Amino acid sequence: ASRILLNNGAKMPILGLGTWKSPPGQVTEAVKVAIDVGYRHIDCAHVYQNENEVGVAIQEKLREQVVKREELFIVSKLWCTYHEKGLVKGACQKTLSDLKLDYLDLYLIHWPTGFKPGKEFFPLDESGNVVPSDTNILDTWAAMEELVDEGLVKAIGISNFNHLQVEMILNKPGLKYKPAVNQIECHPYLTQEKLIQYCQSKGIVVTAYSPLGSPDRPWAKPEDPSLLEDPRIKAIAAKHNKTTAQVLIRFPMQRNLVVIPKSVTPERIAENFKVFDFELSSQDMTTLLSYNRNWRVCALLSCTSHKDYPFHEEF
């Protein structure tokens, strides 16, 4: 089907629109187009600096009665400089005000690592190290549970948490709400079989980000591999008369994942949505899995000393 059941009882569309790097002056039309062609799930974050512009689109389509609020699945994330107990609600409310919403369908802890609070998203020390905060993921989680009890968010989850970090939450003394989602990087060069099996076995839905390999990531290098240009993946697309992006989106769907491709190009927003009329074979699926190379697009050097850095752990 087009939605997956979460452990809070709500249904989540398995295809959503990503918004990182979408320019503020193009994202409003991108989201309007996406809602017109069928998207019902938008992935957002405060740190993306465009939630106000995303919100304008949502509100105009609610106003035009193109969609009802209950049909939408809007996701945002708590940035690293707001992990303190005291700061979490205000951060949520700023995202709700920008998005012109009175609740979120899902709010995530964006990364396991807390950073010093302040105006800078990445506060650095004089030698370029991120300055941590002395907060821990368990008290931040409790702060997230309160947002559920206050009606601000319907579900809470995590992002970029490794298996020991998910387990820390699942084992939290006094845990009130389990995380509904873990949103992680996932594509054929980073297949994440171990972390996905762990999360699914715990009834945690996995959302796959950068499913096209984030070719617009700012730190991309020409020497970097390219999923969209991999002729083996092109061949599989060509077998099904689809584009490579369409194969790349359909692949996590058939692993019972949610996937959130980003685009601000209307033709591609539409193309990326036409992934419900074809299936990859089980053989196609194992072949795509075989391209794993443990290549990660999303990390940041300056954060690697943080005690809560998620990617030293194998998974």
Ligand X SMILES: NC(=O)c1ccc[n+]([C@@H]2O[C@H](COP(=O)([O-])OP(=O)(O)OC[C@H]3O[C@@H](n4cnc5c(N)ncnc54)[C@H](OP(=O)(O)O)[C@@H]3O)[C@@H](O)[C@H]2O)c1
Question: What residues line the site for ligand ZST (CB under 6 A)?
Answer: 20, 45, 47, 80, 110-113, 160, 298-300, 303, 306, 309-310
Determine contact, residues 205/216, Cβ cutoff 8 Å: no
Q: Least distance in Å: CB of 48 to ligand X? A: 7
Q: Least distance in Å: CB of 126 to ligand X? A: 27
The one catalytic residue in 39, 48, 82, 209 is 48
Residue 227: closest CA among 243, 241, 239 = 243
Q: Least distance in Å: CB of 27 to ligand ZST? A: 14
Alpha-carbon gap, residue 59 to 4, rounded angstroms: 25
Task: Write the CB contacts of 9 (distance below 8 Å, at least 6 apart in sequence).
Answer: none
| Per-residue interface string for the shown chain with ligand X, residues 28-47, x marking contact by CB under 6 A | ---------------x----
- CB neighbourhood size of 193 (10 A): 12
**CB closest to ligand X, residue no:** 18
Structure token pair of residue 248: 């790349």
Which residue's entry shows tokens 């559920």?
Answer: 148
| Per-residue interface string for the shown chain with ligand X, residues 233-262, x marking contact by CB under 6 A | ----------x-x--------------xxx
Alpha-carbon gap, residue 296 to 98, rounded angstroms: 31
Q: Is 157 in the site for ligand X (CB under 6 A)?
A: no
- Quick check: helix, strand or coil at residue 262? strand
Q: Look up 48 and say whether it is catalytic.
A: yes
Number of residues interacting with ligand X: please give it, by CB under 6 A: 30
- Quick check: helix, strand or coil at residue 158? strand
- Positions that interact with ligand X (CB under 6 A): 18-21, 43, 110, 159-160, 183, 209-216, 228, 243, 245, 260-265, 268, 271-272, 298
Residues comprising the binding site for substrate? 110
